[PDB]
Design a protein around this ligand. Structure first.
Ligand SMILES: OC[C@H]1O[C@@H](O[C@@H]2CO[C@@H](OCc3ccccc3)[C@H](O)[C@H]2O)[C@H](O)[C@@H](O)[C@H]1O
Ligand code: ADN
Ligand code: ADN
Ligand code: NAG
Ligand code: NAG
Ligand code: NAG
Ligand code: NAG
Lengths: 349, 351
């Protein structure tokens, strides 16, 4: 009667779902991530943020991405909509919100207290180990090898116990392709075209893969998801693809939950400028606003099972409820300027 | 420790009004493995019913009751005399549960085989009403004959030394009560012939009276009649169902009077199908996939049976019987296609 969790993970993925509704199958995978022994550790691909790559033990080896804690739970991030380090607790909260809203497009994420001295250093590749230092309080830290990584901006533990989030790596059978987001930001003081031209969506639905198929409706789904969590940093979106279709996946959601008082409505630009919305998601949104329990109350009950809970402060939770109403206003405004029959699109996905 | 779900909680949350079990092998294997290894905290037997059984309370955060049906025949015993004679076959409950999922009904509670050490697991926790029925046979095997209607000292269930083989059947939670109604196609259990045995137009009479005029009940009974025909269960004189606000469903409960004879096919069990010539659409779709797959129904069922602790479950004869009985079902429905058009035989109720 033995099934290993990494096998559950491999057989769980279809082209239009990364995770499933079954709490038994998902908790089984999460429990493995939370307790598997680390056999190898290195820096990873490249990226622009500080991360580590862990190889978890098993019949087959399963890689995860380690994003360490870099802020207090109640840090307020100010500046550009994409300011700050990657919030490790945002990756956890975004994963459970992904399932709570019925997207199921985010890989599993679990929090974990890592003993850097016992678990990481004995198996760390030289590329990663040479970046371990101590701070003025003799805590074990590492600053990593990346683009913005340097000796003066390390991630630091408590003594040797470092808190972070593990993100499950997709199997090789599901390669991840990446394309620039039509509504990407400029990342300088200029303005992107979608910030000056309110008819910008007309320009996008001309070129593939936005003229037909599910791509454009995916980006509108993800823009609603990104707006709720405050993720304004999806400049390149990523998707999986086989013979049966494609799907934009919610990967790297860590630049979220930076400020619980600001609502960057510019993230909703795909929705507000295109005024299209997949029907199945619209139905799930009306269930979230009609449920007796608010969206934040339901999300925290799922968050309460993670080892490093609390995941979000009350402010960020209440932000979700307020932003959900701001989404409903955006969609209802589309219903006025066009018509509900021309905004709600049923593609059976 | 984090992320823990107990199997009895998986079982409680798994049931909906139109499914007792789910397609997820992970959820099902988790529940089965718990039954196969959970420690028995209580064991008893009730004066009621007609068959020898025991009631086990399995350990856990909450206590979970199962029904224990002991082994009573060799694996290749042949039962003839009447379609419903014999003791309850423990291995039939196991095969019928996996056939229930293989065909996509999901109306049978989980069943697992298990070797019980009566001396170590049962006697220390046995209620006096059960312990007082323990005896020994001519070879000094540990046996018990129980308290029931047909139970007596001369017909006990006997182990090998003290290890008794049997089947555990999960008890449904209290939130899902089981109701019982007489099956319109009951047998007479005497030499008198039932009304459906003399009148081929009998289906007219049932769809007049409730609850067969409206709803899924009649189509459920047609589903289970196909299920019962494949396993050879001619003893469903009273069917049982669950019910809430969102509908009802006849469940495949107590399937032990099956797999008795691999050489006869009691087509009288198919009478609901052949006399009504109606068939739920989703059931027809799953049957045509079973007849078209390269692996026969018997090959697929044995692959699922091979995970049970007490495997082998069925002899080769009974497995080959399923494939032949499936063809007789396909013949029965195709015969309905001639006398009524296919557009009037297949009914789509989205179940
Ligand atoms: O030290 C980390 C640093 O991170 C900054 O976020 C970076 C900014 O650049 C984004 O990538 C922009 C881009 C790259 C390639 C092609 C197109 C666009 C990164 O995703 C993002 O993580 C952050 O703003 C700074 O505050 C600073 O904290
Ligand atoms: N869990 C993941 N699974 C597969 N590929 C990933 C994952 N996370 C990031 N990537 C990809 O690998 C690189 C790491 O930043 C990027 O190209 C990114 O798209
Ligand atoms: N798993 C079960 N769950 C609930 N009730 C059952 C179960 N098995 C048998 N019964 C009930 O107990 C009696 C068994 O002979 C019948 O009344 C039947 O409905
Ligand atoms: C934990 O931290 C301090 C240094 O911050 C160290 O002196 C102490 O010994 C550590 N505890 C153990 C058990 O090593
Ligand atoms: C989807 O594709 C998979 C393989 O990528 C295939 O096995 C399966 O049959 C397809 N699903 C459907 C519903 O056709
Ligand atoms: C079964 O039989 C032998 C003697 O017949 C005995 O020694 C053995 O211990 C018995 N098994 C158990 C489990 O007691
Ligand atoms: C019946 O279905 C509704 C909606 O699908 C659900 O809310 C309700 O809980 C179901 N009934 C019961 C008794 O759970």
């Amino acid at each position: 009667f033995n099934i290993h969790a990494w096998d559950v993970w491999h057989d769980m993925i279809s082209v239009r779902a990364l995770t499933v509704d079954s709490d038994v199958e998902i908790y089984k995978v999460l429990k493995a991530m939370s307790s598997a022994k680390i056999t190898q550790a290195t820096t990873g691909y490249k990226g622009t943020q500080l991360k580590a790559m862990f190889s978890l033990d098993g019949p087959q080896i399963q890689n995860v991405v380690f994003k360490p804690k870099r802020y207090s739970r109640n840090k307020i991030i100010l500046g550009t909509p994409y300011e700050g380090y990657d919030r490790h607790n945002a990756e956890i909260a975004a994963f459970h919100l992904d399932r709570l809203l019925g997207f199921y497009r985010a890989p599993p994420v679990v929090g974990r207290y890592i003993n850097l001295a016992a678990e990481v250093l004995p198996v760390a590749a030289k590329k990663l180990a040479t970046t371990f230092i101590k701070d003025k309080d003799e805590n074990l830290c590492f600053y990593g090898k990346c683009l913005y990584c340097n000796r003066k901006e390390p991630a630091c533990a408590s003594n040797v116990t470092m808190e972070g989030a593990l993100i499950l790596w997709l199997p090789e059978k599901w390669p991840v392709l990446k394309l620039p987001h039509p509504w990407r930001r400029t990342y300088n003081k200029k303005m992107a075209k979608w910030e000056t031209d309110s008819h910008y969506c007309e320009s996008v639905v001309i070129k593939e893969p936005y003229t037909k198929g599910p791509r454009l409706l995916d980006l509108i789904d993800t823009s609603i998801f990104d707006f709720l969590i405050g993720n304004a940093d999806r400049h390149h979106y990523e998707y999986i693809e086989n013979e049966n279709g494609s799907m934009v996946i919610h990967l790297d959601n860590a630049k979220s939950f930076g400020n619980p008082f600001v609502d960057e409505k510019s993230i909703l630009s795909p929705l507000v400028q295109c005024c299209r919305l997949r029907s199945s998601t619209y139905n799930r949104l009306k269930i979230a606003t009609s449920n007796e329990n608010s969206l934040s109350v339901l999300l925290d009950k799922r968050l309460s099972i993670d080892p490093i809970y609390p995941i979000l402060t009350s402010d960020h939770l209440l932000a979700l409820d307020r932003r959900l109403l701001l989404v409903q206003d955006a969609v209802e405004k589309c219903f006025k300027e066009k018509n509900k029959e021309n905004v709600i699109i049923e593609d059976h996905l």
